[PDB]
């Protein structure tokens, strides 16, 4: 019933910045709004209730404000430990409803990925299956595009990507894309290639191999 529109859906910020996250309710909720913080692998934690009351024990750099339909959470000077996901929740009317979340990550300078491609091993081929892997190593920001081409044929739906969390030392990410094919088909073709698009590349890069 009550729609909570939370913004932005994600943001990159630097230590020391003031971060403001916005929640707008489709109707007036009389300040019955809470803010939660959730870090990787941990349960969520309540930061603010009734729009502006600080839960005991939460650092005062967090504050909430607003009334009516417009609310916000502010972190006055961002600290590394604040990275994670934030949600608002209205509890004025049933069903209580959460905003869709704001992913807060650490900002750094753009870094193109180094790209590597790996042919399936002979070990796996006996097994009858073929996995071709493409690795995008140490890049930033997160958005990236990976397109698989087998001879000239664009592959769709037979690949899956996985991404690491920002590295704790260098704030970059890494990503793997695995293209799966039957042993039959793999043999049936010649040129395997992954084309990678990313902001740090002034032009798409392709790494490929001939079966």
């Amino acid at each position: 019933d009550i729609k909570m529109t939370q913004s932005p859906s994600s943001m990159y910020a630097s230590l020391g910045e003031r971060v403001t996250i916005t929640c707008k309710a489709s109707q007036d909720i009389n300040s019955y709004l809470s803010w939660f913080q959730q870090k990787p692998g941990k349960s969520p934690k309540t930061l603010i209730y009734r729009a502006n009351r600080l839960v005991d024990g939460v650092p005062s750099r967090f504050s909430g404000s607003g009334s009516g339909q417009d609310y916000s959470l502010t972190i006055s000077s961002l600290e590394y430990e604040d990275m994670g996901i934030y949600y608002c929740l209205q509890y004025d009317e049933f069903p209580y409803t959460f905003g869709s979340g704001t992913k807060l990550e650490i900002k750094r300078t753009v870094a193109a990925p180094s790209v590597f491609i790996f042919p399936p091993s002979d070990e796996q081929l006996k097994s009858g299956t073929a996995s071709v892997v493409c690795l995008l190593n140490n890049f930033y920001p997160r958005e990236a595009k990976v397109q698989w081409k087998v001879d000239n044929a664009l592959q769709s739906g037979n690949s899956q990507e996985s991404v690491t969390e920002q590295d704790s030392k260098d704030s970059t990410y890494s990503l793997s894309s695995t293209l799966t094919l039957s042993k039959a088909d793999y043999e049936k073709h010649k040129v395997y290639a992954c084309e990678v698009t990313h902001q740090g590349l002034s032009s798409p890069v392709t790494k490929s191999f001939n079966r």
Binding site: S34, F36, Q38, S43, P44, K45, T46, Y49, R53, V55, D56, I85, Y87, L89, F94, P95, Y96, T97, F98, G99, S100, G101, S114, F116, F118, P120, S121, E123, Q124, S127, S131, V133, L135, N137, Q160, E161, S162, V163, T164, S174, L175, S176, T178, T180
Partner: protein, 221 residues
């Protein structure tokens, strides 16, 4: 003093029902509502409903009505949530949390969460395939190599390189659930080219649910 202890991870077949528990302590169970929340990756947090132990009993989100049923046992201070007719859409972490009370409220206490995986898959050790580097030269170039840990169930798998002595430049990616219904992950590491001939790189893989233990040497070739 106030704590909510939730029951262990559960692996259920599609179509079954599962009852998860939330044992509350350090406060008067009957006057605080117990809230239930679902988190599927990629679907943020969802409110399921809440129940007031002893009193005014329940409020459900019309969407989970029929899928979820709450109950709470006052003598044991335990609240329960039953999910029925499970599907993959129900695979998620489920949290209980203590909400408000007639007289007092000042935020929430959250349970540690209960993971529920719904799959018809059978326990299975993975096959570990090498991701061989291609470089072998120029006084210290930079090559990537790794291991593909394929087709195991259920999570998780653990991966280390050279029994843990190589941790620098190592990225073990999140597992991905394949259409086959089995999981797959890769672990990769970048080393100096120069070593590809000298040094050995073995990835150590452990899948406890199937008591699989593999040490995989990955060499250029």
């Amino acid at each position: 003093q106030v704590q909510l202890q939730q029951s262990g991870a559960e692996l259920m077949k599609p179509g079954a029902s599962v009852k998860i528990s939330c044992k509350a302590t350090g406060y008067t169970f009957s006057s605080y509502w117990i809230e239930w929340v679902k988190q599927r990756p990629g679907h943020g947090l969802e409110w399921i409903g809440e129940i007031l132990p002893g009193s005014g009993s329940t409020n459900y989100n019309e969407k989970f009505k029929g899928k979820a049923t709450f109950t709470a046992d006052t003598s044991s201070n335990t609240a329960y949530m039953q999910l029925s007719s499970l599907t993959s859409e129900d695979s998620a972490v489920y949290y209980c949390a203590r909400g408000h009370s007639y007289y007092f409220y000042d935020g929430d206490y959250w349970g540690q969460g209960t993971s529920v995986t719904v799959s018809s898959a059978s326990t299975k050790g993975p096959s570990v395939f090498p991701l061989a580097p291609s470089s072998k030269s120029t006084s210290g170039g930079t090559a990537a190599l790794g291991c593909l840990v394929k087709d195991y169930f259920p999570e998780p798998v653990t991966v280390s390189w050279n029994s843990g002595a190589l941790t620098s430049g190592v990225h073990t990616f999140p597992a991905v659930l394949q259409s086959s219904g089995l999981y797959s992950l890769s672990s990769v590491v970048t080393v100096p080219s120069s070593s590809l001939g000298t040094q050995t790189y073995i990835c150590n893989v452990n899948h406890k649910p199937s008591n699989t233990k593999v040490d995989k040497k990955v060499e250029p070739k």
